[model samples]
Target: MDVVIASSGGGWQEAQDKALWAPAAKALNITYTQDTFQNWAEARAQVESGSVTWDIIQIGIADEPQAKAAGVLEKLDPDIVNKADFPPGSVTDSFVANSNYSTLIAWNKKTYGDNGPKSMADFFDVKKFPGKRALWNQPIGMIEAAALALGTPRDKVYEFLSTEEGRKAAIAKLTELAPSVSVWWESGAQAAQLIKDGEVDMIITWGGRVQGAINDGANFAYTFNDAQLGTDGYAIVKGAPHRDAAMRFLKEMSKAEYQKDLPNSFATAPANMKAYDLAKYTPEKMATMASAPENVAVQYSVDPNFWAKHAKWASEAYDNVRL
Candidate 1:
């Protein structure tokens, strides 16, 4: 049976094709097509109406629980996925890990002249590294980055954001930075363009986008210090047309060899530990992987479960003070 795989679109389509779909299809003897959507809303709509067309989806960790609760995703077979091969807590019952990425402090090298913001604290220190700052429009990375800039220990970020005072503290810090921040970017392209166009000197953006911008001659540099570790992984849509094929595809994708190709293809780290051995990344490339020991040491995982519970309020609160 042929399968249909959905990605969040743009550069991801190419990455998924290289790292997942092509190999999975050939290995499992199943032909597949690709689709793109802006976000999970369309996937939820189709699945909830008993009209699932895509066999597998690349889902944000934050959206996984809601998708599961709505019966939009299928429970995976434990026997098919070797979760022990992945980093601790990287795999879940409904989703197997695909790629891990980060949102970190990146700056235009020419603009900052090799002395840009090196940490979350530097990102918030507008007076010292003064220029137009750019951040994502959403609160997910913003709140966590804010807490870290305010001196919350890397381990205590989610705990801090869990409280009203903590949330308020992050908001207050953002309000202070707002004057220096000229852009609250809504898309990865927009955020990268801010640096490319010289609209902002320093910005917080996904590592992949930053790498792309750098590759395109945008003169960007970044540090994983105080970055937010995130995941985008595969989930089988409930009642998928190609259930058997979907399972087979996932099993193929779980192999460490396939994951090893991801760093070069998508600027994301493979979830499988053994994949790193086969990955053959240089120190420069290794620094960009969210799972690298040195990188992980200085970073914190953004809690999808915490966001699942608090995102509604956080979104509203962010909009009220985002200016």
Candidate 2:
């Protein structure tokens, strides 16, 4: 059997290749190949056109609903994928949770020492922790973080952000920090580089990226306080040439052992709760995992549905006033 897996192409995908796809393929006695795509548009085009060469592809949680609606994805077999092993609401009709990561405040410890910004409010308070900051050049996490900074409770953030008044409030809060922001980073690596090089005192970037930097000897510290959780995962394309192989691939990857290696390999948490016990990390390392109970308690998952609907307006609004 030959299976082709598509990904956006990065360290995380590379980690998946090593920890899951490669080993699973070896176990199933299948020939595995890797491919990359620019965005959902490309993958959706192929799948919807009945020419899905790629058997498995990585996609955003938000994209799953839209992809399924477009009939571009193959619905997984319940018998093959154990829904009970995954976190509730993570396994959907169209997609299974594959990777979990967070976007949060990280600072160069040499500059701020231990008094770094611990919460969204502290991040927006330029007066107290005055210095150049770096943030994502998008509205997804920024808008929600802004709303949280302005005193919206974790559970109410998405509800508030859904309203016109709430949207304006979130943007206003972000605008307040524009003068303090030195640069707006478009990629996780860019955000981490800024802090690693001491070009900026603080940054808001993916937790995995920060962990990578720390492994490379950067003095960075982050807090999960109000971190926005983000997920992207694997899905089998509709009309895939190798459906059985793809299903077997998903089943093999779902095992707890493969998931337990995610934190070590990519710094992202496993979607399988059963993997937690097998995933052994020291106290310092555990803090970086997005699925940590303590971290989960204070954080909010990014609402993919809300972003899909309102992100365009939010981006435009953010651009209008951002320095």
Candidate 3:
């Protein structure tokens, strides 16, 4: 009859709840309350101690692997969240994504004018796209971006990064690029401000963050070419009290109708690519999003399972090389 949905409780997630969850939850007749989930640190206690309170978590899809590995989440029913209906790789044993976003190269438009970077390769070329650069402090997208910059075909990036040679090459590439990257930022708001304020000439940050800056009249631009795609959506607690209702909520949330509101709010690009076809969104609006058909065609969806398995070592290896 009800579900307790939680997330990082940030404004973006709030927008998502206002757009997707609030309506979907109502249509499904599942009353839901909002809260925050801090992941395994505090969540581990609730599930293991048999107090599993929250029913649904608006977790980053990249963390599905972590939730699965930790046994903190319930296996979603295929009937409730058919993987075939969602974008490939957006669903997992424990998660169903409603919205997506990307980590891509963006620049202060005033700095480069019409000559902004076309892809990750341009970000690597200091002389050609000469400017101060910023990168996320995390290894996940940075490694993939570096690999793409080094000419690893987008489809081959994860497989390449899975190898010793691939890891070494990416690290070497980052080592060379690091001296040019003055800010290894950890905050999305910080990433947006960096571009809005012209604090850095260019950055590799989330598309949602970049779009907000541009909407605010910041002289900024981004390219979806070779961006690292990721999703943020729902996961149920392993022993959630209202697990069935949570799945029903997810099914409603996955519909094209609900996903259409995602782009409107700038919470993320919708996970259901079909949302782009809805009359509620026009071509000009689609052009601004990472989920646009043309944009999706050129981007690579980051593999959550790969990161779940490789992130620890990849992170340490990245730290070893980062300045």
Candidate 4:
């Protein structure tokens, strides 16, 4: 059997290929071939056309909603994947978020010291922890974070941010922070590298990237307060030619062994219960991990349905506005 695996670019290619995938291929007795796309937009186009040559597509947190709405994704069968065995909120009927991370506030511990921005409010309060800070620069993601810090409840984040005045207010707030943003990271690796290299003092970046810096000897810390969490799912095409093998691959992936092995290889967390057990993590470290039990409580789930619905407006707004 042949399973065509699709990846967009960057560390995901390495993480999936070098760590989790090879073992699964060997176990399933199938041929695994990898294809790279310039971006997710291309991958989405293929899936939406209902002619996805590749079986499994690596979906981004924001894009999954659009793909699902377009009927590009296949609904996962619980019989194939025992949802009860997995962590709560990890699995979805149409897709399974295989990796998780927070779009959280991060800073160089050495620079900020005992006075870093410990919460999301501080992220907006420039007077207290003032310096160059980089945010995600995406409209929907960062706007929601701002609204959350502005006293919007978790359930109300998307609702408030989606309004006309809400959108304008969010942009105005961002404008206040924009002058200090030294870099606008287009990918996860760039975001992590910027922090590690001291390009910016504090910014909103993924947890694995923050942990990666610490693992690599770069002193940095992340705060959970007002941290926005997002999930990445492995979605199969609606009419993939190799559905059985694809399902088997996903089943093997559900095992903890695959999840726990990511850090040493790529400095990213896998969405499995088995990862990060070698040492006990403090509250700070736990907040960064997507699968951590504590993070699961305050952590907000990504609403792909709304993201898909409003992304075009957000994208256009972002494109029109610049430093």
Candidate 1 collision pairs? none
Q: Predicted candidate 3: what Cα RMSD to the true structure? A: 3.1
Question: Which window of ten consecutive residues has the lowest lDDT sum in model 4?
Answer: 273-282
Which tens-of-lDDT digit does each residue in 1-323 have in candidate 3? 46888775444666678778898988877688777754443566788787988888877777778767888889988666656668777777678888777888888778899789989999999989888999987776898999999999999898888888888889999999989988987667778778789999899988888888887778988888889877777888888898888878878888888877776757376777677677367677777666677888999988876788886787688777665
**Cα displacement (Å) at residue 198, model 4:** 0.4
lDDT of 1 by residue, 92-140 (tens): 8888878788989998777788999999999998778888888887777
Measured with C-alpha atoms, the lDDT of residue 58 in candidate 3 is 76
Over 4 Å off in model 1, which ranges? 48-50
Q: How high is each candidate's TM-score?
A: 0.89, 0.85, 0.84, 0.81
Q: Model 3 has how many clashing residue pairs? A: 0
| Candidate 2 residue spans exceeding 4 A from truth | 36-42, 45-53, 70-72, 238-244, 279-285, 315-323
lDDT of 4 by residue, 220-304 (tens): 7777566667776687888888887888897787666666665444544566655546433456645446656676666576666
Which residue pairs collide in model 4, if any? Answer: none
Instruction: Please give the lDDT score for candidate 4.
Output: 0.70
Candidate 1's error at 142, in angstroms?
Answer: 1.8
